[PDB]
Amino acid sequence: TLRAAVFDLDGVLALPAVFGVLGRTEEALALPRGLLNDAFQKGGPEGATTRLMKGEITLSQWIPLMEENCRKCSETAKVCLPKNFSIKEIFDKAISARKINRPMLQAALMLRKKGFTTAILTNTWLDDRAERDGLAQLMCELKMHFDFLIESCQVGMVKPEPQIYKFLLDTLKASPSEVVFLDDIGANLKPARDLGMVTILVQDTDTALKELEKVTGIQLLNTPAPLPTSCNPSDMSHGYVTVKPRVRLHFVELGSGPAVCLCHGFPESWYSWRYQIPALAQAGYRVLAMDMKGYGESSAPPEIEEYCMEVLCKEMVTFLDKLGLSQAVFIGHDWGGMLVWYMALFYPERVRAVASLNTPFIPANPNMSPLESIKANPVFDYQLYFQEPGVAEAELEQNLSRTFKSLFRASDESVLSMHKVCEAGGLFVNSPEEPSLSRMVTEEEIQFYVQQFKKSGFRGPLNWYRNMERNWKWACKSLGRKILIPALMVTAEKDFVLVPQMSQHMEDWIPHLKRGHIEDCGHWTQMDKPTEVNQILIKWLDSDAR
Amino acid sequence: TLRAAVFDLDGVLALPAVFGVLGRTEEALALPRGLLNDAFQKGGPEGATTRLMKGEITLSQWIPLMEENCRKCSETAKVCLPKNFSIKEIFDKAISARKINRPMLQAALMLRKKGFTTAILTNTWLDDRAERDGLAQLMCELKMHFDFLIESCQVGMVKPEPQIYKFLLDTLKASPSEVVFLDDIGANLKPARDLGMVTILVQDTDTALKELEKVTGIQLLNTPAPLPTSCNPSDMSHGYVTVKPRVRLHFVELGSGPAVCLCHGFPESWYSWRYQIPALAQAGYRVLAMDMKGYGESSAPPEIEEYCMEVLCKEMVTFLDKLGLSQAVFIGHDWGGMLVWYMALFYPERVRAVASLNTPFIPANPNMSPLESIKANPVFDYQLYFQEPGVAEAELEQNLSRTFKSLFRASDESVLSMHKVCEAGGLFVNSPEEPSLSRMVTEEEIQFYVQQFKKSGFRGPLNWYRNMERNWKWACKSLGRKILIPALMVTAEKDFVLVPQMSQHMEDWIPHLKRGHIEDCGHWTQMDKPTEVNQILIKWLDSDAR
Numbered sequence A, B: 001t002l003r004a005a006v007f008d009l010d011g012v013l014a015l016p017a018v019f020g021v022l023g024r025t026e027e028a029l030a031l032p033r034g035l036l037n038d039a040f041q042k043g044g045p046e047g048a049t050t051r052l053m054k055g056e057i058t059l060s061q062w063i064p065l066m067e068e069n070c071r072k073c074s075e076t077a078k079v080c081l082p083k084n085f086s087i088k089e090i091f092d093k094a095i096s097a098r099k100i101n102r103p104m105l106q107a108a109l110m111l112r113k114k115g116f117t118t119a120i121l122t123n124t125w126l127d128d129r130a131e132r133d134g135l136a137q138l139m140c141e142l143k144m145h146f147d148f149l150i151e152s153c154q155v156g157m158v159k160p161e162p163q164i165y166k167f168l169l170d171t172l173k174a175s176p177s178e179v180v181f182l183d184d185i186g187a188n189l190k191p192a193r194d195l196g197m198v199t200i201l202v203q204d205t206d207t208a209l210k211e212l213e214k215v216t217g218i219q220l221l222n223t224p225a226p227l228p229t230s231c232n233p234s235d236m237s238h239g240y241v242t243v244k245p246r247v248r249l250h251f252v253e254l255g256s257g258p259a260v261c262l263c264h265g266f267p268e269s270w271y272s273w274r275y276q277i278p279a280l281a282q283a284g285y286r287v288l289a290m291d292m293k294g295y296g297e298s299s300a301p302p303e304i305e306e307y308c309m310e311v312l313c314k315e316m317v318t319f320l321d322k323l324g325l326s327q328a329v330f331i332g333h334d335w336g337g338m339l340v341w342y343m344a345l346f347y348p349e350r351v352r353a354v355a356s357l358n359t360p361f362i363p364a365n366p367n368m369s370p371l372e373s374i375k376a377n378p379v380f381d382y383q384l385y386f387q388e389p390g391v392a393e394a395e396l397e398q399n400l401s402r403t404f405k406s407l408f409r410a411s412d413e414s415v416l417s418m419h420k421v422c423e424a425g426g427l428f429v430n431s432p433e434e435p436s437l438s439r440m441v442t443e444e445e446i447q448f449y450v451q452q453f454k455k456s457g458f459r460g461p462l463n464w465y466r467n468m469e470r471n472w473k474w475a476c477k478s479l480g481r482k483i484l485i486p487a488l489m490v491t492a493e494k495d496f497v498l499v500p501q502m503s504q505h506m507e508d509w510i511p512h513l514k515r516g517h518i519e520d521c522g523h524w525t526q527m528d529k530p531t532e533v534n535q536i537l538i539k540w541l542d543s544d545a546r
């Protein structure tokens, strides 16, 4: 009965195998078959390659030792190497060409999700090349998905030596019979087999996965498209910035590169961006996912005036000042989308680029009171119910689990009406006391929002809706301006409050506006269609932000 | 009696004035005197320039309006503009050429240090140019040094209008007589003078500073070289990463760009880097100043084994993994310097570059026990006193203020002997109960270290010295390796424990080693000679790390 899956890196989790390159170089350079291959394995266990794999020497120290072996292999071969020969250049591009074998990674991910203990067992080196970051990035990406990474150069043991297998079994705390081991090199499979471990010779991925699926009884081949990597809150870097004596802002941070500031809506969390954070960090960005003022670990003062847009924007500017950031890309959703257009309008120097999900940019009407403007739309009637302090708080704070389960639902799952909510006397009047769990969220994810909202409740979050008149007056100062920095508007087909049609006149204010559109997507864009959101944002960031 | 100083940006805090460029362009392009100057001020209070300065329009919207004014000014002038004319290009380079007037900033800094309320009052615009980051960086740098920044485009008022002066006085909470106002434009000084404010017409900096010094009675001209900008702990972004169930690491973060990880020694803090953090962030780096395991807000487990170098290095690798950093530059001092060479030796793929202050890289002696190696040097006798658990803790924890005041001293201020400390029965045996305050630290800075050390005491910090045998065995695995990634060794002339001579054979292990040397510098390099440390690190980072 299996409970652990072990994978090799070269030829299994990463393709093409760096090993394959030596045979490819020989035939491309019309050299005798296996010559470069011989130089690589010369001296066997006391040879330069074994010393490299054991961590006795670095890759840079090894390069001249392999080069010498190439000369010695030619003396015996009675053939000559051509002029511009560089072992460094061959390995540099071999390593650079090697990419993650995505279907093998997905299978490993699927096995772990079903309760397996996963590990990478690899014969590798200490890379001190000027170009080492490429592989550091690859190892960094792959390792986060496994319980253990066992590298020969760190443990001082190599495959096929039997001690590394006993080391692996001890690390796994599993009997050989409980372990499936996958490798592309027959010689390295043999010692695992002798212990009674299930082994898979990996030639082509599909056959290897077919063998893996047969032997584990779990579906890995032809499975539905997986969700992007999500965030485990306790594994994140948590940051805290005091923006003013009584206001502290909390954020989660991941990656290196240009600063990307994520701004959630109502009633959300930094966690609402869980599917974007790893994807954007992997795409070459430094993600700062905020807990907006009034939410989670951020300060939640009681006063309504603490939540007017001008104050919220000034605080986000102070946040950049204190982190030493001259700019950041601002990406918002719902209330965050509103703040984000206003950041672009009042602080264009601090905004590298601006993107919004669902929230359009609609310029304030100088001739219509914000309350009259709410009158113009039946969808925005819930905003009038939010005006009276205490009313909405009482209903939303009464049962937290019910609140989030009722709100966080895909377009076709809605148990709630946004109409005559004031007439009905609440947004949970027509709703069950025990809502069913939406296909968008696990029970664990709902419970995270519940624990977050237990600290400050809905007062601070509801206060964002309580400054309509102040926001309107402030916005009227920008009526002569245009947004001329890079901008993206992402519309969601099934958002029945923030409808795509509301964005139609945006090009009059943002002439160079870029667009994105998501079909079959409700209000909760980030969790509804994460794969699509990531694809649109990454593509726009690489073209307009970078 | 003065208590506030107000400065203009253009022509006062930033030079050359963007205004100066329009007269320079005219004579370089042989255009009629004042023509470009006329186009800039056209329509006066209802003109495009006033609308720009009030925040009614952005800089990008303004560019075509100024261009039109240049054509209208030519119709009347009866002269023609030449082919390749761009107002954008003229302003782009004018803004780009404009740099901080360092002596004016130092005077403002000196006035604030003496208790003055400082502010910047400027007529500026909303910059939405593709090149806006340049000015964002300049504003970001300047603003942190003042109590207030009042920008015309944010307040919707402009100089010379009287309302901005009443707005300034109200912001300052000061009577005009208590305020000195400096400006390069006579027309903008006049309304401040009418209120009874002390005014300075700024032509050349020296005369303006001469007038300022005379009127305030504080020395600003010919003053000794100021210390670099330090850190106010409550104004920093504080980060927390869980590296393992019982271990959390704390760090302070500032800036954007390549990751620079700062590793303090014994018995220090992230705060030991207070003079480097703002300087390195300003130089284009993302600074991560650590609280090493056992210190400040970082976890301090009691077990000795939790502090062996292998465990400490693995945790720093996990720290990078959790922040999503494939690499960082590692800069260490004392015990941090030791960890930093070991990070380079065991994880070269994760280390972009390595630098050490005072701490040399000395390879473990396979033939000598670490205790015998300590025997070989009288300077390292204090390490034997640190071996017995409880002894050093009791002496160091007895009086915290005495501990730091006695330890943190410049080369010629020492009140302590590092010899026969075990024979004497402590390192505070020959020391006063009330040590004098060293010229290196303020009373406030000592009190910061006192409050930090009150949380966990000296057990965790002393445990770094308690794994000599484990460290020696681990280090022996690297005896065949060389450090071939970019490296910097900075020696301190007056460090009587970590003497420069100890670094002499480092080139045998690190052939491409770069060096730095600081004269008249004790053990506490960072606070002893901050200006020099910053200069050496910035120069090396720009050449080898970037």
Ligand SMILES: NC1Cc2ccccc2C1
Binding pocket: A309, A338, A342, A362, A363, A364, A365, A370, A468, A471, A472, A475
């Ligand atoms: N349209 C008004 C409503 C609102 C909310 C936030 C910021 C500006 C404005 C203007």
Ligand SMILES: NC1Cc2ccccc2C1
Binding pocket: B309, B338, B342, B362, B363, B364, B365, B370, B468, B471, B472, B475
């Ligand atoms: N020289 C030994 C003392 C020490 C301290 C830390 C890491 C390695 C070693 C080797």
